[model samples]
Target: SNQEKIKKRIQKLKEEFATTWHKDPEHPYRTWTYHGSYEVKATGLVNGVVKLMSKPWDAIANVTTMAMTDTTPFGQQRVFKEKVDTKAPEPPAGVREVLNETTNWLWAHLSREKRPRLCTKEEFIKKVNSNAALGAVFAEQNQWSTAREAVNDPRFWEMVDEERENHLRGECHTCIYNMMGKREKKPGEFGKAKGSRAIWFMWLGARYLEFEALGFLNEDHWLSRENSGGGVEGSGVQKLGYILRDIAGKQGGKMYADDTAGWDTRITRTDLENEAKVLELLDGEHRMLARAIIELTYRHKVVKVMRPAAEGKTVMDVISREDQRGSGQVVTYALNTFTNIAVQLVRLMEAEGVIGPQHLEQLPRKNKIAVRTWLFENGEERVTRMAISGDDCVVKPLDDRFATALHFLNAMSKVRKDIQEWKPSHGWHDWQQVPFCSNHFQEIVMKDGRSIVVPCRGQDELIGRARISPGAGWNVKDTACLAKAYAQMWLLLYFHRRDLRLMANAICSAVPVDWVPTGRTSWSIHSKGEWMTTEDMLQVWNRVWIEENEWMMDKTPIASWTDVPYVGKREDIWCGSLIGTRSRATWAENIYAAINQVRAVIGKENYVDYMTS
Candidate 1:
């Protein structure tokens, strides 16, 4: 046929066109975008070793027949509504609702499940019981991203039980960007230095933590949580695997191969350089896939850069040290407590009428509005105020609630600032040293070949925070709404059509739970954004908020100011130190610092009004 000849002709034409105008300017994108994407129907393969590229999804999207925008297979157009200053995209269409009942389903997937050589749970239990090495992994089993690291001073396993699992680690020791700190060729270059390490550790931590928190809040009520960094540690890369798996399946929709074929991936130089280019294109154009490829390659590269700091003692030692680099819990409970105090204060302000949009409309953020202290034993309200003691203004409650609330408030402020400063607004490259596949996305695949793109189930979650107007400048209600919806989106996407459905099932279940957000501001809290106590778990999405209200998460309430004992000591809460964990002998120190932190925000000099005594 004329196929081969036509292909050669097009190649010539491409070169000529490039030489004509594109080459004169030494341009980059003209030829391949227009000609290379010819959708050659004969099962074309490219990329060095030749990966099976599926254009069917691309084909389906390129056509705009019987539809407005060919971007979504379902013909769903973005719905827009009028708001004051900021604009909101229509509610997402990818939120698939389904009911699933599985216990420990979320945590059950945590890293190691022990023996799988046998068919039955009994034999599985027997195998686990017989091998202390296997059994060791299951003990207190929350340290996840489990794997083996055999160091040669005679490393041990069941001869292979050399595996280790850590709750704090996301693996390759600690996280991909951990070494990026060292990898940066130049430092302090902040006229434009992307928060590569910061975003990876913090944003990823917050998102993942919220995802798992949603799981703990709704489904798979397992032992408990180490936070979401663990959730993503288990899920992020795997989610990408699923994405490619689905894409692979759909790719074959164009060909429908009956037999199976596996390519030889052993060609080291070939596979490496080929993917380096594929990775380059993807890194330049996409989000999730690029993140997966780069994180993996770069992580292993860091593996080659050898052990950091101590530079290891050798292979096994090198591997072990690198694995725990950036795995920490600040992002975990930090986000949780931040949202905790965020809601508590929002609720506290909205309770009877402390702060509202109208009050905020006239008030400055630096000024603190006067509010009622806790109810007395007789049930009468007393206005909160400061009295001078030891040359300083003070309001001391024998109770710990106010300080606790203040600790969390400061935490929220800190994390918010971190996000704003380090997370990058638009130009991430300006501030980053390396490539990070940043921002949100969802792959819209269809029966016919297509080109439309929609966000994955939870990818749209960040839009909730985007909805808050900076014109209002961190309105308390707006931030609370962001926290609530932010967690909700994390819950929805964690189980997006996965085997163990995490919180996804609870959100989309046909039952009455208002778990999944139907619109941009689907929850009733969008307007009032008030934190209220609720008994109904399914009808409202307050389960997380309610759980935060527990003593375990009591950062949101204001305590009564009564007992006198002054001079100041300062403390700020990190992780659960604000809670009853570790030796809280430093609690006085933490509370004092927390009190000091809050004073900067809620200072006596900045009191807004004198409440009736």
Candidate 2:
């Protein structure tokens, strides 16, 4: 039975594995660098100084900014802004003491470092702790009481560029650090989550998988509501998503489920023998390997959008168009970008025959002159006034119309750039933006008793995706997100194509939450194939929550956000190979790096203007 099951899984994998490969001309695809050492084959001997030319400006200086104000910093991170709003349960003050005790106890039990290569947790901690610099790191780590306390440590972000290349072997230690210490959520969809729930959730999934593999779980255990061996229902998946959202509370306007004790109790029932097997699996790294197999094999529906790569003047133009430091330039860019979107939207509306030619350009409100005769009654009088009702005849400027459109575009929808980077050993490879739109729409609300003559407002969604750097995106929890997204993609494609909406719901609901900002109140959900957004779903989620007669759910069924499809390229989704993940710095830093090269392409600042002029 075991061999048959394995073979069955293997065949399924072989069939779907080909589906995950993607092609992108926009960003040069590279592979993950988990090798044992940094590339040094062409090294010019030991440098007089081990230094970097780009280190000074590599990381973004500010992550707390929202948008450009007059005195605003140019670069900002909406992902981190979500972090600021989300909250998490920080370990109690006694946390550091116990972790230290655990380390010290392990050190006492495990052998001391007697070989050249490191092996045990004791040795790892000993080597890192014995160092004078790292000694302070540990001491300060132990001192932190709040979630952000340790993460804000300058040492936390102070990463060695070269030291990262030799990380093929230390993930065991990495795994331990995530369990006991902290790790940020991978960027993109779940970028806002408080990863506090990560270790627990991953372990839970591992246990579930292991028990099922060992025949401890029923075939229906994965998604059945039957509870003899613990209920493995679709709602459980939804509730798992809920726990992720609620555990780190304070998402300003969150609507999560209240009754999760059912799912909670159903999922957590475990036996000691199964637990021991899980430990054995972890010790050998086989559990992760096994999970990786499933993760690699299970794919979700995703488009590898290779947005037009900007170079030289194109780069400058893109940034300048996006920038709005001076208020005078603000209206210009805002109106220009928005107008472009309106034009496209109108074109789509026209293409779909939803509206007449140039209909969106017409005044959504119609105005007409009304003549009324005076009645002989005491209350009647001859009145000549302009009567205005909604008309799709000609474009009329409304006082609130502009604000409403901007509000929906800027506020309700996600309008930030997705910075996804692969680990690139070579200097910046093809930098790319893979924008995946959402399938969302909402009315702009016709205020002052005004309404649309015909349906012209609601349509598809827009959530842009872009830059990702290995400095942040290449960690344990982060990579977990990448392959996880891949698997979810495959699974979604499988379920949806076959029209198994129920199974589709299961995988999507079971999507992981995040670990970010060291514990921001508005923690992000990990990628839900993340191309599709969880922003609207969370507003109605009711799992692992405590609530009552407050605000009721917005459950009037519009559409499943996950029903999102690629707006640009949907014929055949190009899945990226593991070898093609590239890395780049922040947009500001990207410009900084690109400036030197562009200077070679065009020397004089005035020449850049000369060509444009």
Candidate 3:
């Protein structure tokens, strides 16, 4: 029969498709900017010129530096002086005797102490010092006098500003002042002379181009901050801003090109396609490396800059000699910001009942501790244990935790600024610290068709919709994360609901997962209709099976059996214009046919019953 031949043909096609492509980025350009243009824009050039031209004094020029001293740099030598024994050094012993005693002591204690233990280096050193005859402790208290003066050496502490600049540059690859070429200016440089005049023009051009560029700029390019796509013309507004901004400026400005006026040779569109093609060729390693660079650069800049922003001060003002604020001030400002953010996030969670009220806190560590312990101690035996022991809780395996943590961090990071922006427009979004929603489930579908759902530490409502009961007071503070958690759980439940699988060798007669009702499988199904219980829908799903000579069934192909839903709105139906047909009318019909065929093949007995019934 044709059936046997068709199966063989299908198998052959699968193998052919497998051989057609490899699972890797197919191009080599992703390692760096593939094009020869490394130009910075005119705005960048201007910004660099201004920053370099203006010599701003740092307030903490005389502040004590941790990076200065020797081992004493770890802390003040005087403060830790008691940690060291004042015992005098012993005279050198004969080599054979010294070796014998040292070996004997090591052999005796080898089994008593593990290679890695909680015992601090001090404890280990003390043990060795106790056997002074067998060992000697050589200490290097800075060869120079005080750590303050030692680290204060112009050569040493002088590079701190340079280090900070480099760090900032890592986050922001393009300079605001130095647009094109490779002009690595110091922190103060703000002039356009560092790079090419052409680069400066491009910088100025970006501002004029912003109206078009911001709308045209893709998500990937925005997330990356800098991308190979969009060429010289379609660069992001931010990239253009860098060209216009001064090194110490809060934001960059723009200018237009009055002399040049033509887009016929635009490279922006091709840039996207070419970049996509290049990315399609990258190996996993290169792709990950690129992402790492983008993420670190973005995160660090936000953390560092926002710390100052939270204090209502620009970095220029903070570093000025008038205030001469030290790192201590910056750290304090950052912690307070963190607390405020965390409190708001926790309050959201608390309102959602995602975590108990007891778990809510202003401090990150305190919140984590409270939530983690509370969930473990009071959560359902199966559900609670799974949440904690799985990727969603602190007790999850390290690898899983890392993967979950990264996804949460990235997603939340996008919202951090957006939330800040929205708050002013919407309402006051206050929290105890930066609200890092680390606890929740992450749903990711890969390009290769595989999907992974990971439960994390916080709910992610931004990715999908959440339920808001009617009559729920709004303006009353929508500070509830419970809605998000519920949505997340609902999605996760739907993924496995249709299977009717048991958990840990235990089966519930009418229930599958603990939270969901049986027969109600997917969010789509729930949205479609409301049933008193799942059983009413069970019969609906339990379609009558059919063969060529079988009874009519729900699984019957719509092409041969059913009328399609109208393509347009119901008003269009009254107008007597039916846009869609029941015969292969929509994608849903195609899916229905496919699923029915699958069910026909697998549930033969059910199909037979459907036919006979």
Candidate 4:
């Protein structure tokens, strides 16, 4: 019984609300700026801006621009004037003068190289006569060879500086009148007929006035440099930045990551309400334009269709028929239009006291003392620690080879200025050129009668982490270190512990033979926290060589020479056959043979220079 009563009351309220006001779903008056010609014809005004049973909402510029050709006028001219008068107050004359001066200065200075330079009087005349629009607008002369010479003088910038000073002193207006109207600067001589000087002077003033009301005239140095927003007053990017900072403060100094969660729930309503208040504070046309900008930026979902549903006669047709027809498709027009509107809106918000310098102030700086103290105490500790979740692990600077390699990489960054960035390929050399390497032993004949040999190559994989197969060390200096380490460790094991000689021999032979452990495993931790016999050690070493060589093969294998580990019963094993030596070969012979091969190719002197350096 309570639910029925509540439903009836809600329905009655909605009906009352509809009668009082209805925002047309098709039109969405807030985001709609103008009606152009076609939209003006079909489904004219949903609310008041059309024939006006209610208040007018369109901009005076929109009205005036349309009014030029709009014989019947979109709405009453009185409505346009009312909307204009109710908008924000115009900027002061002093601000306008300052803006004009700044704009003129910028125009003369910026892109000076790109600005056209008339080299000769003949060339200047040719250009002026050819460009009818340019001559009419800037010079006000059809034939202007004589007047062009004076304006195009090499010392023109000198005149501009003087003229700019005159503009500051309020003398430029008289000079412009003398040039454009009277065609006289001094007494009795009507010589300066080109009129570009006057045109430029007036053009600056008009251009400055266009953007002056929108807050761009008061930008500080930093905002000017970033150029994130359009190079006009009160840029949309600047406004967006302010919005982000403002919301961050409201949400305890961190913005919500996802727009749907904290943002839509908490910040959206508050920001929109605040924005609506700002819109209320604005004058009619500005308010409408600002609302359009906001809707375009944040609430584009309101626009269900970019094009109206019609037989070829759509919004684009209406837009193209208007002036400025050559500007691309509807997409380009919309983008440019919104960009201009956004800048204007930003300017209006600033002018009307909704957006202010206070909103743009920077956040406080971090404490220097606290920052320095923290750095001094835990700088190195922070560098060494690598944490996975709550679990912490300390990475040694140089203990394991992998860690040391990464540590070296970090160290390389610190002294990059001193170290020229060189590729590993720069150190590579042709193995065929290396002396003391048996050419016949290394060379292999392919099925296509192509002769190839083992070439000096860089390490394809870091030995610490091999996935495809345990890879072999290359003959390059990158592998030189690995080879030296292995050779040295093998020699040490042979001399210091005869108990592990079988393990060392098995590794050299590349054969898997399980021998009983004789309690001489010093670096057992190297195998990732496990002790291994001769067979286990040899299998690991052999897999690397097998995988490394396997990668170089160009054809599919008929039979696997060695079974990849953890696979059951695979192939006939051929261990270390490529190198052509067993455990009987001396360590010095095997090691130096590879090392000498690399040294001969790379130039022993060049190798030593890099190794020592």
Among these predicted structures, which one has the highest lDDT?
4
lDDT of 4 at 512: 12
lDDT of 1 by residue, 281-383 (tens): 2222232323332333222322111111122221100011101112122222222221222223332333324333343223333223233121111111111
Pick out the ten consecutive residues of candidate 4 with the lowest summed lDDT: 256-265
**Residue 391 miss distance in model 3 (angstroms):** 26
Residue-level lDDT of model 3, residues 13-42, one tens digit each, is 234444332222221222111111111112
Task: Point out the higher-scoring one by TM-score: 2 or 4.
Answer: 2
Instruction: Report the candidate with higher TM-score, 1 versus 2.
Output: 1
State candidate 2's TM-score: 0.18
Tens-place lDDT digits, model 4, residues 1-613: 3232123223433344443333232542331332222222221101110111001112222221221111122222222222211212223332222222222222332222332111333333344333111212242122333335434554543444454343333232111100121111111102111111111112222112111212121222112212212222222111222222222222121111100110111112222322233343346444443443333222321111122324533231110000111111111122222222222222222322332333332211232232233334532232221110000111111112221121112111211111232211011022222211001012333344432232111111111111111124333332323233332233222111221232223222221122222211121111111122333333433333222333334443212212212111111011011122243234323433433444454342422211110
Best of the two (1, 4) by TM-score: 1
In model 2, which regions exceed 4 Å deviation? 1-181, 184-219, 222-613
State each model's CA lDDT, in order: 0.21, 0.20, 0.21, 0.23
CA deviation > 4 Å runs, candidate 3: 1-284, 291-296, 299-348, 361-613
Considering TM-score, where higher is better, how would the candidates rank from best to worst? 1, 2, 4, 3
Better-scoring candidate (TM-score), 3 or 4: 4
Per-residue lDDT tens digits of candidate 2, residues 33-118? Answer: 11011111110011000001122122322211111111111111121122211222222222222222222322222112211111
